Design an enzyme around this catalytic site. Structure first.
Site, PDB file in Angstrom:
ATOM      1  N   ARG A 170      17.985  25.911 -43.777  1.00  0.00           N
ATOM      2  CA  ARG A 170      18.803  26.647 -44.722  1.00  0.00           C
ATOM      3  C   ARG A 170      18.477  26.340 -46.158  1.00  0.00           C
ATOM      4  N   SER A 171      18.046  25.121 -46.413  1.00  0.00           N
ATOM      5  CA  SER A 171      17.839  24.691 -47.765  1.00  0.00           C
ATOM      6  C   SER A 171      16.668  23.750 -47.781  1.00  0.00           C
TER       7      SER A 171
ATOM      8  N   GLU B 210      13.672   7.883 -37.900  1.00  0.00           N
ATOM      9  CA  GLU B 210      14.753   8.857 -37.976  1.00  0.00           C
ATOM     10  C   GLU B 210      14.829   9.797 -36.745  1.00  0.00           C
TER      11      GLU B 210
ATOM     12  N   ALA C 166      18.067  13.730 -59.726  1.00  0.00           N
ATOM     13  CA  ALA C 166      19.264  13.558 -60.564  1.00  0.00           C
ATOM     14  C   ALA C 166      20.456  13.022 -59.742  1.00  0.00           C
TER      15      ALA C 166
ATOM     16  N   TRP D  72      19.090   7.424 -45.304  1.00  0.00           N
ATOM     17  CA  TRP D  72      20.442   7.966 -45.109  1.00  0.00           C
ATOM     18  C   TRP D  72      21.557   7.197 -45.834  1.00  0.00           C
TER      19      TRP D  72
ATOM     20  N   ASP E 259      14.058  21.482 -50.361  1.00  0.00           N
ATOM     21  CA  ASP E 259      13.407  20.934 -51.523  1.00  0.00           C
ATOM     22  C   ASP E 259      11.959  20.875 -51.090  1.00  0.00           C
TER      23      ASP E 259
ATOM     24  N   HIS F 246      13.171  25.953 -52.646  1.00  0.00           N
ATOM     25  CA  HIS F 246      13.205  25.722 -54.061  1.00  0.00           C
ATOM     26  C   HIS F 246      12.395  24.478 -54.505  1.00  0.00           C
ATOM     27  N   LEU F 247      12.136  24.449 -55.807  1.00  0.00           N
ATOM     28  CA  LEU F 247      11.455  23.343 -56.490  1.00  0.00           C
ATOM     29  C   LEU F 247      12.375  22.943 -57.642  1.00  0.00           C
ATOM     30  N   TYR F 248      12.753  21.668 -57.711  1.00  0.00           N
ATOM     31  CA  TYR F 248      13.565  21.175 -58.834  1.00  0.00           C
ATOM     32  C   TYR F 248      12.786  21.212 -60.122  1.00  0.00           C
TER      33      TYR F 248
ATOM     34  N   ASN G  47      10.091  17.050 -43.317  1.00  0.00           N
ATOM     35  CA  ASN G  47      10.657  17.885 -42.272  1.00  0.00           C
ATOM     36  C   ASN G  47       9.580  18.450 -41.358  1.00  0.00           C
TER      37      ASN G  47
ATOM     38  N   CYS H 154      20.549  20.490 -42.872  1.00  0.00           N
ATOM     39  CA  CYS H 154      19.553  21.252 -43.614  1.00  0.00           C
ATOM     40  C   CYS H 154      18.635  21.968 -42.596  1.00  0.00           C
TER      41      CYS H 154
ATOM     42  N   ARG I 216      14.299  32.992 -23.429  1.00  0.00           N
ATOM     43  CA  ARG I 216      14.338  33.348 -24.842  1.00  0.00           C
ATOM     44  C   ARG I 216      15.568  32.733 -25.533  1.00  0.00           C
TER      45      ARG I 216
ATOM     46  N   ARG J 267      24.430  22.233 -56.466  1.00  0.00           N
ATOM     47  CA  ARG J 267      25.858  21.822 -56.569  1.00  0.00           C
ATOM     48  C   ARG J 267      26.149  20.739 -57.618  1.00  0.00           C
TER      49      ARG J 267
ATOM     50  N   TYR K  77      23.345  15.398 -37.322  1.00  0.00           N
ATOM     51  CA  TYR K  77      22.307  15.727 -36.334  1.00  0.00           C
ATOM     52  C   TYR K  77      22.403  15.134 -34.925  1.00  0.00           C
TER      53      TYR K  77
HETATM   54  O1  LIG Z   1      18.306  14.467 -49.720  1.00  0.00           O
HETATM   55  C1  LIG Z   1      18.360  15.061 -48.657  1.00  0.00           C
HETATM   56  O2  LIG Z   1      19.348  14.767 -47.627  1.00  0.00           O
HETATM   57  C2  LIG Z   1      19.005  15.102 -46.345  1.00  0.00           C
HETATM   58  C3  LIG Z   1      19.514  16.263 -45.745  1.00  0.00           C
HETATM   59  C4  LIG Z   1      19.181  16.649 -44.446  1.00  0.00           C
HETATM   60  C5  LIG Z   1      18.298  15.825 -43.800  1.00  0.00           C
HETATM   61  C6  LIG Z   1      17.802  14.706 -44.400  1.00  0.00           C
HETATM   62  C7  LIG Z   1      16.944  14.042 -43.568  1.00  0.00           C
HETATM   63  C8  LIG Z   1      16.342  12.861 -44.012  1.00  0.00           C
HETATM   64  C9  LIG Z   1      16.648  12.413 -45.299  1.00  0.00           C
HETATM   65  C10 LIG Z   1      17.528  13.124 -46.122  1.00  0.00           C
HETATM   66  C11 LIG Z   1      18.116  14.297 -45.653  1.00  0.00           C
HETATM   67  C12 LIG Z   1      16.919  14.796 -42.389  1.00  0.00           C
HETATM   68  O3  LIG Z   1      16.263  14.536 -41.399  1.00  0.00           O
HETATM   69  O4  LIG Z   1      17.738  15.902 -42.499  1.00  0.00           O
HETATM   70  C13 LIG Z   1      17.394  16.144 -48.358  1.00  0.00           C
HETATM   71  C14 LIG Z   1      17.678  16.967 -47.275  1.00  0.00           C
HETATM   72  C15 LIG Z   1      16.801  17.989 -46.958  1.00  0.00           C
HETATM   73  C16 LIG Z   1      15.682  18.183 -47.757  1.00  0.00           C
HETATM   74  N1  LIG Z   1      14.900  19.335 -47.497  1.00  0.00           N
HETATM   75  O5  LIG Z   1      13.669  19.349 -47.655  1.00  0.00           O
HETATM   76  O6  LIG Z   1      15.496  20.349 -47.095  1.00  0.00           O
HETATM   77  C17 LIG Z   1      15.386  17.341 -48.826  1.00  0.00           C
HETATM   78  C18 LIG Z   1      16.259  16.316 -49.143  1.00  0.00           C
HETATM   79  O1  LIG Z   2      30.236  19.098 -54.215  1.00  0.00           O
HETATM   80  C1  LIG Z   2      29.685  19.891 -53.452  1.00  0.00           C
HETATM   81  C2  LIG Z   2      29.085  19.569 -52.193  1.00  0.00           C
HETATM   82  C3  LIG Z   2      28.514  20.532 -51.463  1.00  0.00           C
HETATM   83  N1  LIG Z   2      28.473  21.847 -51.869  1.00  0.00           N
HETATM   84  C4  LIG Z   2      27.851  22.881 -51.022  1.00  0.00           C
HETATM   85  C5  LIG Z   2      26.833  23.774 -51.716  1.00  0.00           C
HETATM   86  C6  LIG Z   2      25.531  23.020 -51.511  1.00  0.00           C
HETATM   87  O2  LIG Z   2      24.446  23.945 -51.519  1.00  0.00           O
HETATM   88  C7  LIG Z   2      25.714  22.354 -50.144  1.00  0.00           C
HETATM   89  C8  LIG Z   2      25.088  20.984 -49.996  1.00  0.00           C
HETATM   90  O3  LIG Z   2      23.748  21.054 -49.453  1.00  0.00           O
HETATM   91  P1  LIG Z   2      22.558  21.682 -50.307  1.00  0.00           P
HETATM   92  O4  LIG Z   2      22.413  23.016 -49.711  1.00  0.00           O
HETATM   93  O5  LIG Z   2      23.077  21.881 -51.684  1.00  0.00           O
HETATM   94  O6  LIG Z   2      21.253  21.015 -50.113  1.00  0.00           O
HETATM   95  O7  LIG Z   2      27.148  22.226 -49.964  1.00  0.00           O
HETATM   96  C9  LIG Z   2      29.046  22.241 -53.067  1.00  0.00           C
HETATM   97  O8  LIG Z   2      29.039  23.395 -53.458  1.00  0.00           O
HETATM   98  N2  LIG Z   2      29.618  21.227 -53.795  1.00  0.00           N
HETATM   99  O1  LIG Z   3      19.669  35.604 -14.920  1.00  0.00           O
HETATM  100  C1  LIG Z   3      19.428  35.156 -16.041  1.00  0.00           C
HETATM  101  C2  LIG Z   3      20.186  35.410 -17.228  1.00  0.00           C
HETATM  102  C3  LIG Z   3      19.809  34.860 -18.388  1.00  0.00           C
HETATM  103  N1  LIG Z   3      18.706  34.046 -18.499  1.00  0.00           N
HETATM  104  C4  LIG Z   3      18.338  33.444 -19.795  1.00  0.00           C
HETATM  105  C5  LIG Z   3      16.888  33.629 -20.216  1.00  0.00           C
HETATM  106  C6  LIG Z   3      16.929  34.934 -20.992  1.00  0.00           C
HETATM  107  O2  LIG Z   3      15.874  34.943 -21.952  1.00  0.00           O
HETATM  108  C7  LIG Z   3      18.311  34.916 -21.652  1.00  0.00           C
HETATM  109  C8  LIG Z   3      18.994  36.261 -21.773  1.00  0.00           C
HETATM  110  O3  LIG Z   3      18.721  36.895 -23.046  1.00  0.00           O
HETATM  111  P1  LIG Z   3      17.259  37.426 -23.392  1.00  0.00           P
HETATM  112  O4  LIG Z   3      16.747  36.378 -24.285  1.00  0.00           O
HETATM  113  O5  LIG Z   3      16.466  37.347 -22.138  1.00  0.00           O
HETATM  114  O6  LIG Z   3      17.237  38.673 -24.186  1.00  0.00           O
HETATM  115  O7  LIG Z   3      19.130  34.060 -20.812  1.00  0.00           O
HETATM  116  C9  LIG Z   3      17.931  33.740 -17.393  1.00  0.00           C
HETATM  117  O8  LIG Z   3      16.951  33.016 -17.448  1.00  0.00           O
HETATM  118  N2  LIG Z   3      18.341  34.325 -16.220  1.00  0.00           N
END
Ligand SMILES: O=C(Oc1ccc2c3c(cccc13)C(=O)O2)c1ccc([N+](=O)[O-])cc1
Ligand SMILES: O=c1ccn([C@H]2C[C@H](O)[C@@H](COP(=O)(O)O)O2)c(=O)[nH]1
Ligand SMILES: O=c1ccn([C@H]2C[C@H](O)[C@@H](COP(=O)(O)O)O2)c(=O)[nH]1
Ligand SMILES: O=C(Oc1ccc2c3c(cccc13)C(=O)O2)c1ccc([N+](=O)[O-])cc1
Lengths: 264, 264
Positions: free
Chosen positions: A166-167, A58, A263, A80, A169, A207-209, A177, A146, A126, A21, A94
């Protein structure tokens, strides 16, 4: 770690060229999965030095449901700071979703307690899941989650967990993580009287920057050292009563730290 | 398909013994990932006959935001009948979250339109995501979402999608789910003028019911046939205007259908 360097080599070999971004270039793949058997050792990368200090603080902060950086400031944890507003608010990130997901009808859902109850009373479930992906609250977060979503699983006395990220680095974020969730699995397992199973890491945009290529090549030249062992010095009364000093790492013999820039 | 039989063999070889909520036995693994390059062909399993009829109708129904089975009854599609109450209500399942996720502040969020906008205007985004995992609404759903969460990704003119599936009956459900999302990728891609990339399937609890062992062994004896080709006969004005007759499958030469029973 083998799995981590393999991912790293994979992104070099298979990544397509992709901007973020800010417009910073990356090499990127979509969809990857790694598995860490936690009984083999704590999966903290050894091919560069990583510190557990900020990871623990954390996690504890997440578990408290706190979204203000104040507690991290108390402990001089600054990871943070770039996202926090002037009062130090991050919006409903979180901690707020884990501990207090808000519903249309005015409730606040504690997903951590929910999951602990389920692991104790219905381990075959499950649907033992925590999500931070609260669609209606994304706009207010300083950052979209993330590590969006995670599921636990119990078989044969062993607790496993899968994270959807989801994402990713791979250079800067991934080692952090992985150790973070691995820690949480060990705390969860302890609180439910289970042993530890697998942490499964699943990535979306992985990904890798481009400005991390020299560091990447350097780290890929190194050999994984044996995995360390996590020590939990004490057993707390609940998942919410862990203290920083409860955790030790033994047998951590890493190659030297490597710095990677961002960056702006 | 190679990937699908591999998963099937994997669960036989590596599954641990695990019950469901009814108490029906399974062999189960946790964490798996498969990739289908959609340019190779439409990933509808060939080692048993699968019909697209109900898959298409259900997707169209999802896309309308409809949670009442009425539209499926109109077309004699009965796959949701076991969950529907007396008026045919399923509570706030898939369609309602995709099209109208409710927020604490009274809004209803159309995640499908959100994602389409993002794919057109910001294809590099790492947060192009639809979630059905609305924590506050789980209790009202006839069923907790199995396909919980999905992310799209664009690189090199190609649209990819990853699904997280918390729970997977590999024999009965998986072939259905794969073809369903693959279809949606083709509709999404068409509406954004992209070609099709990969569908990546990620599973949590990935299992085979013990009363599906004979069928499993039978299917594993068969050889995948070449993948069929999806034809979209017409280009609609939007993602919401697809009609059942818009879709054809060519070159589908499956081995014979195989029936699998459920316990109650
Ligand atoms: O710069 C980042 O912001 C965060 C995004 C989401 C995050 C953190 C955490 C600790 C520190 C930073 C961040 C964290 O525990 O969850 C970042 C976030 C996630 C990653 N990652 O490996 O996905 C790498 C860097
Ligand atoms: O200015 C911004 C801020 C956030 N994002 C969206 C896309 C980025 O992928 C995500 C921020 O988390 P990352 O997935 O980029 O780590 O939010 C943007 O597009 N533009
Ligand atoms: O009577 C029930 C109904 C649901 N579940 C919980 C655990 C099951 O794993 C999930 C239902 O979806 P499945 O993951 O089992 O497919 O909900 C129970 O423990 N007991
Ligand atoms: O019996 C099931 O209930 C459903 C649960 C979740 C579902 C469906 C869908 C269509 C038909 C049934 C179901 C569907 O699209 O999403 C079921 C659900 C999911 C699977 N699965 O493969 O995970 C297999 C069976």
């Amino acid at each position: 770690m083998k799995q981590y360097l393999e991912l790293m080599q994979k992104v070099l070999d298979e990544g397509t060229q992709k901007n973020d971004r800010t417009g910073t270039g990356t090499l990127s793949i979509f969809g990857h999965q790694m598995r860490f058997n936690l009984q083999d050792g704590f999966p903290l990368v050894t091919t560069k030095r990583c510190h557990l200090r900020s990871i623990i603080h954390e996690l504890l902060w997440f578990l408290q449901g706190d979204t203000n950086i104040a507690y991290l400031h108390e402990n001089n944890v600054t990871i943070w700071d770039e996202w926090a507003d002037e009062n130090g608010d991050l919006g409903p990130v979180y901690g707020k979703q884990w501990r207090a997901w808000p519903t249309p009808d005015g409730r606040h859902i504690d997903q951590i307690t929910t999951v602990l109850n389920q692991l104790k009373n219905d381990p075959d479930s499950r649907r033992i899941i925590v999500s931070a992906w609260n669609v209606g609250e994304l706009d207010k977060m300083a950052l979209a989650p993330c590590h969006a979503f995670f599921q636990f699983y119990v078989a044969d006395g062993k607790l496993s967990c899968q994270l959807y990220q989801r994402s990713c680095d791979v250079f800067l974020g991934l080692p952090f993580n992985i150790a973070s969730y691995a820690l949480l699995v060990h705390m969860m397992a302890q609180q439910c009287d289970l042993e530890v199973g697998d942490f499964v890491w699943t990535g979306g945009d992985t990904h890798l920057y481009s400005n991390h290529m020299d560091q990447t090549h350097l780290q890929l030249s190194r050999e994984p050292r044996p995995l360390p062992k996590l020590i939990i010095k004490r057993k707390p009364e609940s998942i919410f009563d862990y203290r920083f000093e409860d955790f030790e790492i033994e047998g951590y013999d890493p190659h030297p730290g490597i710095k990677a820039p961002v960056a702006i």
